[PDB]
Scaffold this active site. Structure first.
Site, PDB file in Angstrom:
ATOM      1  N   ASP A  12      16.748   5.715  -7.913  1.00  0.00           N
ATOM      2  CA  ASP A  12      16.225   5.754  -9.291  1.00  0.00           C
ATOM      3  C   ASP A  12      14.885   5.083  -9.488  1.00  0.00           C
ATOM      4  O   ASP A  12      14.335   5.116 -10.587  1.00  0.00           O
ATOM      5  CB  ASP A  12      17.239   5.262 -10.345  1.00  0.00           C
ATOM      6  CG  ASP A  12      17.587   3.846 -10.179  1.00  0.00           C
ATOM      7  OD1 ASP A  12      16.967   3.094  -9.397  1.00  0.00           O
ATOM      8  OD2 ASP A  12      18.532   3.403 -10.948  1.00  0.00           O
ATOM      9  N   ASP A 122      27.081   2.969  -3.998  1.00  0.00           N
ATOM     10  CA  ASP A 122      26.052   3.967  -4.295  1.00  0.00           C
ATOM     11  C   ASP A 122      25.001   3.781  -3.213  1.00  0.00           C
ATOM     12  O   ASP A 122      24.217   2.839  -3.251  1.00  0.00           O
ATOM     13  CB  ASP A 122      25.523   3.705  -5.711  1.00  0.00           C
ATOM     14  CG  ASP A 122      24.964   4.913  -6.429  1.00  0.00           C
ATOM     15  OD1 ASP A 122      25.106   6.031  -5.946  1.00  0.00           O
ATOM     16  OD2 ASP A 122      24.412   4.654  -7.547  1.00  0.00           O
TER      17      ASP A 122
HETATM   18  O1  LIG Z   1      26.908   7.389 -11.229  1.00  0.00           O
HETATM   19  C1  LIG Z   1      26.857   6.869  -9.930  1.00  0.00           C
HETATM   20  C2  LIG Z   1      25.782   7.681  -9.167  1.00  0.00           C
HETATM   21  O2  LIG Z   1      26.082   9.090  -9.239  1.00  0.00           O
HETATM   22  C3  LIG Z   1      25.236   9.847  -8.401  1.00  0.00           C
HETATM   23  O3  LIG Z   1      25.628  11.204  -8.607  1.00  0.00           O
HETATM   24  C4  LIG Z   1      26.920  11.557  -8.152  1.00  0.00           C
HETATM   25  C5  LIG Z   1      27.807  12.011  -9.335  1.00  0.00           C
HETATM   26  O4  LIG Z   1      28.142  10.908 -10.134  1.00  0.00           O
HETATM   27  C6  LIG Z   1      29.087  12.652  -8.804  1.00  0.00           C
HETATM   28  O5  LIG Z   1      29.803  13.103 -10.005  1.00  0.00           O
HETATM   29  C7  LIG Z   1      28.717  13.750  -7.897  1.00  0.00           C
HETATM   30  O6  LIG Z   1      28.046  14.780  -8.598  1.00  0.00           O
HETATM   31  O7  LIG Z   1      27.963  13.248  -6.757  1.00  0.00           O
HETATM   32  C8  LIG Z   1      26.706  12.664  -7.134  1.00  0.00           C
HETATM   33  C9  LIG Z   1      25.988  12.187  -5.873  1.00  0.00           C
HETATM   34  O8  LIG Z   1      26.656  11.042  -5.266  1.00  0.00           O
HETATM   35  C10 LIG Z   1      23.800   9.709  -8.856  1.00  0.00           C
HETATM   36  O9  LIG Z   1      22.934  10.489  -8.006  1.00  0.00           O
HETATM   37  C11 LIG Z   1      23.376   8.269  -8.882  1.00  0.00           C
HETATM   38  O10 LIG Z   1      22.107   8.140  -9.428  1.00  0.00           O
HETATM   39  C12 LIG Z   1      24.376   7.454  -9.710  1.00  0.00           C
HETATM   40  O11 LIG Z   1      23.995   6.084  -9.662  1.00  0.00           O
HETATM   41  O1  LIG Z   2      16.360  -3.234 -16.548  1.00  0.00           O
HETATM   42  C1  LIG Z   2      16.460  -4.628 -16.231  1.00  0.00           C
HETATM   43  C2  LIG Z   2      17.921  -4.912 -15.900  1.00  0.00           C
HETATM   44  O2  LIG Z   2      18.221  -4.253 -14.649  1.00  0.00           O
HETATM   45  C3  LIG Z   2      19.576  -4.437 -14.265  1.00  0.00           C
HETATM   46  O3  LIG Z   2      19.734  -3.703 -13.054  1.00  0.00           O
HETATM   47  C4  LIG Z   2      19.905  -2.296 -13.267  1.00  0.00           C
HETATM   48  C5  LIG Z   2      19.128  -1.558 -12.169  1.00  0.00           C
HETATM   49  O4  LIG Z   2      17.739  -1.807 -12.312  1.00  0.00           O
HETATM   50  C6  LIG Z   2      19.397  -0.054 -12.240  1.00  0.00           C
HETATM   51  O5  LIG Z   2      18.762   0.613 -11.145  1.00  0.00           O
HETATM   52  C7  LIG Z   2      20.902   0.223 -12.223  1.00  0.00           C
HETATM   53  O6  LIG Z   2      21.159   1.626 -12.411  1.00  0.00           O
HETATM   54  O7  LIG Z   2      21.481  -0.498 -13.325  1.00  0.00           O
HETATM   55  C8  LIG Z   2      21.375  -1.912 -13.091  1.00  0.00           C
HETATM   56  C9  LIG Z   2      22.311  -2.650 -14.028  1.00  0.00           C
HETATM   57  O8  LIG Z   2      21.929  -2.346 -15.375  1.00  0.00           O
HETATM   58  C10 LIG Z   2      19.839  -5.908 -13.969  1.00  0.00           C
HETATM   59  O9  LIG Z   2      21.229  -6.130 -13.702  1.00  0.00           O
HETATM   60  C11 LIG Z   2      19.538  -6.732 -15.197  1.00  0.00           C
HETATM   61  O10 LIG Z   2      19.660  -8.102 -14.826  1.00  0.00           O
HETATM   62  C12 LIG Z   2      18.145  -6.413 -15.719  1.00  0.00           C
HETATM   63  O11 LIG Z   2      17.921  -7.053 -16.983  1.00  0.00           O
END
Ligand SMILES: OC[C@H]1O[C@@H](O[C@H]2[C@H](O)[C@@H](O)[C@@H](O)O[C@@H]2CO)[C@H](O)[C@@H](O)[C@@H]1O
Ligand SMILES: OC[C@H]1O[C@@H](O[C@H]2[C@H](O)[C@@H](O)[C@H](O)O[C@@H]2CO)[C@H](O)[C@@H](O)[C@@H]1O
Length: 213
Positions: A12, A122
């Site tokens: 991400d 993940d």
């Molecule tokens: O939400 C956790 C992560 O999901 C990732 O996508 C998954 C999806 O949730 C499943 O339902 C399925 O479609 O497989 C996907 C690939 O593992 C997503 O790409 C991540 O960004 C999320 O953090």
């Molecule tokens: O946005 C600041 C916030 O980030 C938090 O981590 C995020 C991470 O950046 C993101 O990639 C993931 O999907 O979600 C986590 C959890 O929200 C972090 O935990 C916080 O301390 C921070 O304020």
């Protein structure tokens, strides 16, 4: 920790959660990077997913050690744990389904998310999918792929910023495009090559076994 887990895949671009000070008792937090993939020296820089300028570093990506062993990074939610207990911890995953069944990947936890289930890893790989927050949009205008699950074919890695391309290709090359494989895991001492990339080692690291290659 040991146990069973479920995997997903992600990238991400956001500042990883364990890149903040004070998340756990560590040598130093995980490095974050600017939008040009340069390491920041200040661990308190606002995340690019929250209107700031700190993003995930491209060297916190997976790679093959050999055909049966990879090293890399994950976001985790460990049952019975917290960020205090998982941040910068390493885990040896032994896959139990998919084309990678029986292979081992040692990952360092660098982040978490509110959408992760119990013992869900993940696994970070560019082009695995941004999920809820598209950090990559503000970093460099976005990555290819489905919002969840990311790209479909390895040729799409040709579209990735160069620093992210090897990690993108690893998904198809080593991981054989496995779709959410299951695994068992054991908490282990972090390999030095993993710590060199994240910068972060737990004060409790040596309390765990060296992993079995
Ligand atoms: O939400 C956790 C992560 O999901 C990732 O996508 C998954 C999806 O949730 C499943 O339902 C399925 O479609 O497989 C996907 C690939 O593992 C997503 O790409 C991540 O960004 C999320 O953090
Ligand atoms: O946005 C600041 C916030 O980030 C938090 O981590 C995020 C991470 O950046 C993101 O990639 C993931 O999907 O979600 C986590 C959890 O929200 C972090 O935990 C916080 O301390 C921070 O304020």
């Amino acid at each position: 920790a040991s146990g069973s887990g479920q995997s997903t895949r992600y990238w991400d671009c956001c500042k990883p959660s364990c890149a903040w000070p004070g998340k756990a008792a560590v040598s130093q937090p995980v490095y974050a990077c600017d939008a040009n993939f340069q390491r920041l020296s200040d661990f308190n820089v606002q995340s690019g997913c929250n209107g700031g300028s700190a993003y995930s570093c491209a060297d916190q990506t997976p790679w093959a050690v050999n055909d049966n062993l990879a090293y890399g990074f994950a976001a985790t939610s460990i049952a019975g744990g917290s960020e205090s207990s998982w941040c910068c911890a390493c885990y040896a995953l032994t896959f139990t389904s998919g084309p990678v069944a029986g292979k081992t990947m040692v990952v360092q936890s660098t982040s978490t998310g509110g959408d992760l289930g119990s013992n869900q890893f993940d696994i970070a790989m560019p082009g695995g999918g941004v999920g809820i927050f598209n950090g990559c949009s503000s970093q460099f205008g976005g990555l290819p792929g489905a919002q969840y699950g990311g790209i479909s074919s390895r040729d799409q890695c040709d579209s990735f910023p160069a620093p992210l391309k090897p990690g993108c290709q690893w998904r198809f090359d080593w991981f054989q495009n496995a779709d959410n494989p299951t695994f068992t895991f054991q908490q282990v001492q972090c390999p030095a090559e993993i710590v060199a990339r994240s910068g972060c080692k737990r004060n409790d690291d040596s309390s765990f076994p060296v992993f079995t290659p």
